[PDB]
Design a protein around this ligand. Structure first.
Ligand SMILES: *Cc1c(COP(=O)(O)O)cnc(C)c1O
Ligand SMILES: *Cc1c(COP(=O)(O)O)cnc(C)c1O
Lengths: 367, 365
């Protein structure tokens, strides 16, 4: 399978291996100075005040919602059109996810859909910056502010995303991911930025056993273990140093897909009208059987037979067994239409121009 | 020139394993995880091995997979790391803290039996400092009452009990944290002989995904999977474990011999047949006997360039547990928790490093 083109691969090379050598030689391999440097780097990148490195964005979401006091009786507004981690963490704190629909062409929640779903129980709103584009975060924030409801941003796809001239997470609270397919990776990892001093203090304690000072450190309240090792933080620092060039190459690839699929029936997501810089984490197409003459599932299967990988980001959460059975009344037409028709085609900066031509040619052949 | 109480043994073999993973492009959970799990089944003899992001997370998902929650009691020492107590509480269950033997810091079958109620749903013995608890006797109490025994084997990679590796049967959780005898900086691994428990754990450490067709959320789960970068490090460290533990044993034997004529008191070696992994070398520091307190000894050792650790400040004496469970009174735990410290023990210590520690302790007596 040496000729298989996956939909993503990391850009790991000599720089990463040299950073690893440095940490190994130091003998300080779990959380330490590389974590501190990564956190400082994300404060400089975003402009926000506090950065907390964690073992995954999922764990980051877990401890952020926990630190806010989210629990039984509370509602959290979220798309269904996202990764299931967020819905799972809401449920596992005992709270209730309130799933709302998304815009049919950029797959992100709207301020109107948020406002319609607010109740006296709502304790957080979690927009997703999808595929590398930002949600209309000022408008969503304005809805939250009017009701006194915090907005927690799922920025997994948004390392390098700008919104109205600032990096995502420049204010408010946002959670980044360093999973293997993310634009910067340390295999598994994540990072929370926030402007809220008390929230940051609670998060730092709750990702490391609830330890704090009452004197020596001791458990103040039970917490979890979601700290990031320095081996991983060192990889993340290298990948952050590479991120601008990685995203530039991703944008060049995505622009070519936009142009050369314009005269095919496959339908990319639409670029938001608000000012932004897209990180191009994923290149998603909608495959409508009536327009394309091929279904999404069959397209993925035939691409695979041609040696071309694809991903499904995402099967809507409310269509999956647990949520389907717990929340059977949830009906989200834009989500359901897209979830059945989307796939992610290869997009990663180590792709060659000929890799891109191979994908485009296969899509023209399969139309 | 500082001699810490622990340092990992990382070199070219670890760097070469990392190189291989990076070159493959498959950096999170994958074939190295599979190989690590198979290697732990070969090491222990047990059937299922599930690699996880930390032993804490492993404890979280193991108790969750057993159905532990509100209304359930879990018997545990207070004399352990706070992670276990925290995970019990954060599942909504109730920790029932019991005392430990005053000289090896492990729970006894009698103490377990005395704490059992109709609400008890698990017993969690700790294999402490590299020695095994009397696990057959504790298991027998559990079996008589129908209560599962989940073993905290963080300290016990390489520990044998009656000729088998810890975790050869039953359920046990290992840690690969930086100070453990084999490390991948952070990581852990669950072994179990229970097919259904293993199936649930595997799903619950990766988002609750399972097959009802394609995988989907069957019930919400957590994210505690181990990356292949880390699994590859764990494999190298497992290949080194026997030699690492042999060197630890040589150092520990020299401490036992050359501290015999000091008032510092090591833990006692259990009477049941075992092989000690020598994760920690713990001494008790009684001011009446030693002329110096535990805290002052740690401070003066640090001033001499010698690090020490405290494994552990008993959980029930820490703010949350002291205020939530003020009634807990555990005399052997309290006596030892105020008097123990861990002196340097790791396989990269040279003979001169060990002599430095012994010399300082004789000087400070
Ligand atoms: C995968 C992902 C997450 C979780 O990130 P991890 O770092 O893998 O835990 C959260 N939100 C979205 C939208 C994701 O794609
Ligand atoms: C530290 C430790 C744990 C937890 O292990 P992690 O890998 O750090 O999560 C559990 N039990 C004992 C006895 C420990 O020392």
């Amino acid at each position: 399978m040496s000729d298989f083109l996956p939909f993503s691969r990391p850009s790991m090379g000599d720089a990463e291996l040299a950073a690893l050598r440095e940490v190994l030689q130091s003998g300080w391999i779990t959380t330490g100075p590389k974590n501190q440097a990564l956190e400082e780097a994300f404060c400089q990148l975003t402009g926000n005040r506090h950065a907390i490195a964690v073992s995954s964005a999922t764990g980051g979401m877990h401890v952020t919602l926990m630190a806010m006091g989210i629990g039984p009786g509370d509602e959290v507004i979220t798309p269904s059109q996202t990764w299931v981690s967020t819905l799972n963490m809401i449920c596992l704190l005992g709270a209730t996810p309130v799933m709302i629909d998304v815009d049919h062409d950029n797959l992100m929640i709207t301020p109107e859909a948020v406002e319609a779903a607010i109740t006296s129980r709502t304790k957080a709103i979690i927009p997703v910056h999808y595929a590398g584009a930002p949600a209309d975060i000022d408008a969503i924030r304005a809805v939250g502010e009017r009701h006194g409801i915090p907005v927690i941003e799922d920025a997994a796809h948004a390392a390098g995303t700008h919104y109205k001239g600032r990096h995502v997470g420049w204010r408010g609270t946002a959670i980044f991911s360093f999973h293997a397919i993310k634009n910067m990776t340390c295999a598994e990892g994540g990072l929370i930025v926030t402007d809220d001093d008390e929230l940051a203090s609670r998060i730092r304690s709750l990702k490391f056993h609830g330890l704090g000072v009452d004197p020596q450190a001791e458990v103040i309240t039970p917490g979890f273990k979601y700290n990031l090792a320095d081996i991983n933080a060192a990889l993340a620092l290298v990948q952050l140093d590479k991120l601008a060039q990685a995203n530039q190459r991703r944008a060049e690839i995505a622009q070519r897909y936009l142009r050369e699929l314009a005269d095919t029936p496959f339908k990319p997501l639409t670029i938001p009208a608000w000012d932004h810089q897209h990180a191009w984490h994923l290149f998603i197409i909608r495959v409508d059987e009536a327009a394309c003459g091929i279904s999404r599932d069959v397209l993925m299967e035939k691409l695979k037979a041609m040696g071309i990988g694809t991903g499904l980001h995402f099967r809507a959460a409310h269509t999956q067994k647990y949520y389907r059975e717990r929340f059977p009344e949830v009906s989200l037409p834009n989500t359901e239409w897209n979830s059945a028709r989307i796939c992610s085609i290869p997009l990663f900066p180590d792709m060659t121009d000929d890799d891109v031509t191979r994908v485009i040619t296969a899509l023209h052949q399969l139309s």
